[PDB]
Design a protein around this ligand. Structure first.
Ligand SMILES: CCCCC[C@H](CC(=O)NO)C(=O)N[C@H](C(=O)N1CCC[C@H]1CO)C(C)C
Ligand SMILES: CCCCC[C@H](CC(=O)NO)C(=O)N[C@H](C(=O)N1CCC[C@H]1CO)C(C)C
Ligand SMILES: CCCCC[C@H](CC(=O)NO)C(=O)N[C@H](C(=O)N1CCC[C@H]1CO)C(C)C
Ligand SMILES: CCCCC[C@H](CC(=O)NO)C(=O)N[C@H](C(=O)N1CCC[C@H]1CO)C(C)C
Ligand SMILES: [Co+2]
Ligand SMILES: [Co+2]
Ligand SMILES: [Co+2]
Ligand SMILES: [Co+2]
Lengths: 183, 183, 183, 183
């Protein structure tokens, strides 16, 4: 008995609210386990590298992040090196907080599963750390730079009701079927 | 005798360039007449109230504006009065320039045929003057306020390579299939 | 007060289910009244001529139809005549059934708010009868031809889990930003 | 130096035409080289596994196909095995013809870069041979089964003016942001 899930699209107010914290008594519980399993499953089906609970319609501070080596390798080596893209294992964070460690800004195109079909360049900090709980309830601080830091920031912004269209260079917004190419 | 026309979508660089003037050699000529006729035809087919030549792929300073009574009438009356939405006849402007007459800002939702399917709230000046040539080279000046002034501003921005997403309140950006309703 | 509503998009399984009937006990009731008020409000905000409860996420046999004169005059006279498009007052039907009175097929482009942004040609019967209850349980039978018969058939198909892409000439499917025009 | 390329979307009549053959005089030439390099670049940028000239607005019988290992490994092993998905190198075909080698039908979801953002299940033959010329005019033949045969048939359809929506199971058409998941 399979089921349907959908990623909410811009216009749904759940993407602009401030997600609520998960309560201690829910940690390690069945309901949070179903939510984390669904987030990871959607994230992986869509081949995206992060997803947050509000995008599945659940206004709670939960997000998952993963970048498999196959996806880094899909990126041409020069572009991979420019973006400082390196793989990293799946991590799920509950009630996370972000601390900026290197505030230099780096700008590259990104897109969001909740604004399907578009990209724009967005400046992001070079390095950050995210601290929060696992769904079992243990604390972890994960520090990263480059593309991983960009993913952490994009996903953290979703828990504050922020989407990348709020931070983009709007003259670079584009449907994914238009692209710049080498002559 | 039928052909296809298309409204360019965001990503096409024609929408971000600064449109070149129409050379005087072209005024009153067949090529300019085919372009103005096509802009008016597509504007009326799409039931929209302004269109510019870069949106049909032509990087030239030409735009058309029209608000038929039936479109105003489709607006509920209290919204129509708040927006100061009143009908006006077709005008076509070639090499137009804009001056602000009343710089008070008014915010309402707008959409654009070149960012199909979305709306966002955009501040606009209350009143403006657009001056330019009709397709035959005669001077035309139109001072407008309220919703007519907002239409003029949106079309004139297209000839500078500016889309409403560059000026919007991005937290109000929405797919048109999401909307606020009265309970 | 203010709330959000959305029209479900294709992929949502609610659009492919067969809506359940409203039980006799519910006719004239406050829950049905909430649904019918919401359906008509969304229909009027989107300026669409018909809407069904599955498109608001509610798998119940309830639809609304309305074609105001202004909306109707937005179509040029020659096209309204070809399409037999005439205004008609609001009807809300509960548990409707359809009978075909004239099975001649008529084909014109149609779109659906649950497949936002596309049109395609769809053959429809020239005249039908819809019979059902008004939200109060009164029996209402409406015989319609031409464009109103097409709206009726499109909304009734929603209650059976059928969308217009199931019945279209697929070689005429188009984004709305492409159109055939007269030279 | 850089320019912009776009994948034409449904509605553009170039996608429904039957593409003209490449004339013998053009084989090996610079214009055909520019077209093939552009196809391969867009195909690689978009991480898709085939692309045809009509989709870059050029109504000529040219297509390219490529499934790199990394892109292949984005798909989980169980799903790869089910779909008979394996990597294969770049091939570019000019004036190709298709012969069916195993007419057994296999049904899975596919999407098209010219119908951005949707998928639907389409039955396809289990094995085919494509034969045609390379850009230098040498005979190229490739016998393929499973997922590779699907991609061949999808690209060949584009040179006949056929899109997947003409062959799909329409009840399975879905926005990519709706998906079936495991409980
Ligand atoms: C990069 C920062 C955003 C990471 C997370 C998003 C997915 C998402 O919206 N999470 O909320 C994603 O994977 N986006 C991808 C993305 O932005 N990419 C994928 C490769 C490169 C970059 C576009 O430049 C695709 C799915 C649009
Ligand atoms: C109002 C300022 C924009 C006027 C021009 C646009 C058409 C366009 O993009 N021209 O470039 C339009 O008619 N847009 C309409 C529009 O913005 N409307 C219709 C009335 C209300 C407002 C949406 O709030 C619809 C078609 C999206
Ligand atoms: C004609 C049969 C479909 C009518 C009802 C639909 C809206 C809807 O999906 N109902 O479920 C509608 O108004 N569609 C309009 C529609 O198809 N129109 C407007 C009149 C002309 C035709 C576009 O050719 C627009 C919103 C797409
Ligand atoms: C499989 C048959 C179509 C192959 C070629 C297309 C791209 C295209 O339109 N070529 O004309 C594609 O790669 N489509 C992908 C595709 O259909 N996929 C990618 C992974 C599996 C399958 C989705 O079920 C995405 C990009 C939609
Ligand atoms: Co996102
Ligand atoms: Co516009
Ligand atoms: Co519909
Ligand atoms: Co395709």
């Amino acid at each position: 008995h399979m089921s349907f899930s959908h990623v909410c699209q811009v216009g749904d107010p759940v993407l602009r609210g401030v997600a609520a914290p998960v309560e201690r008594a829910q940690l390690g519980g069945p309901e949070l386990q179903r939510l984390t399993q669904r987030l990871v499953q959607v994230m992986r089906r869509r081949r995206c590298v992060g997803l947050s609970a509000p995008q599945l319609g659940v206004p709670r501070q939960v997000l998952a992040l993963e970048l498999p080596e196959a996806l880094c390798r899909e990126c041409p080596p020069r572009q991979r090196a420019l973006r400082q893209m390196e793989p990293f294992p799946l991590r799920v964070f509950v009630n996370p907080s972000l601390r900026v460690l290197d505030s230099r800004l780096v700008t590259f195109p990104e897109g969001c599963e909740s604004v399907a079909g578009f990209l724009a360049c967005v400046p992001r900090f070079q390095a950050v750390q995210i601290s929060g709980l696992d769904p079992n309830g243990e604390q972890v601080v994960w520090q990263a730079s480059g593309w991983a830091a960009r993913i952490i920031q994009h996903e953290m912004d979703h828990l504050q009701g922020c989407l990348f269209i709020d931070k983009m260079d709007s003259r670079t917004f584009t449907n994914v079927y238009w692209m710049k190419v080498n002559d």
